């Protein structure tokens, strides 16, 4: 059994053409995992993950912040104590508009890696 | 399999008792269940002040997030309390329970794959 403070766990920074000021936290891991995996994921103010979409759903829980969801057409923003279900294939992404980090929970079947 | 995408309160989901031989003091939202899920369920557990998850094991593991409090974690050996921001893993087959030994709710998430229910 792993108990574990998910702050210690070293984020990664990812800056590229679709994702920029975004930190992603890997809890429980392909090493771990038999079926899914556990990411906790630290959107800076202005950060953003642009509109994509995978062949597997995510499950995200909103720790922190207000978080606002790109969808297909249109946007939504929710809080902390959210939770959001996203289907396999369906267009999202993330934006925090806010002057002050923004956290969630992210996870997601293994095939989709960590 | 259907499209769109879910974004709810957890709070606007209700928390049902849970009364078991090996459990009392809980209560659980199920968020994203059953009818839902490809395949991992989404619930938070609220521990009642004493209430208490009795050691147990099942074929299927845990990953656990801790949303709110001090949950005390029951191992085959010994207990470890951990608050708020902490995550557990739980591998299938282990030995593990809770406590709450403190005043106030403790909340936690807890995911399992759909196979062994929600
Ligand atoms: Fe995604
Ligand atoms: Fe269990």
Redesign the interface.
Same mark, same amino acid.
């Given at each position: 059994?792993? $108990?574990?403070?998910? @702050?210690d766990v070293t984020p990664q920074k990812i800056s590229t053409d679709k994702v920029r000021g975004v930190r992603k936290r890997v $809890?429980?891991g392909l090493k771990?995992?038999?079926?899914?995996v556990?990411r906790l994921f630290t959107v800076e103010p202005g950060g953003l993950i642009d509109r994509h979409s995978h062949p597997?759903?995510h499950?995200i829980?909103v $720790?922190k912040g207000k978080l606002t969801?790109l969808?297909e057409q249109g946007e939504?923003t929710?809080?902390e104590?959210? @939770?959001?279900?996203?289907?396999?294939?369906?267009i999202?992404g993330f934006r925090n508009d806010t002057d002050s980090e923004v956290e969630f929970?992210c $996870?997601i079947?293994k095939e989709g890696g960590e």
């Open positions: 059994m792993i $108990l574990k403070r998910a @702050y $809890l429980i771990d995992a038999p079926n899914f556990m597997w759903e499950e829980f $720790l969801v969808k939504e929710v809080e104590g959210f @939770y959001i279900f996203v289907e396999p294939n369906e999202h929970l $996870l079947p």
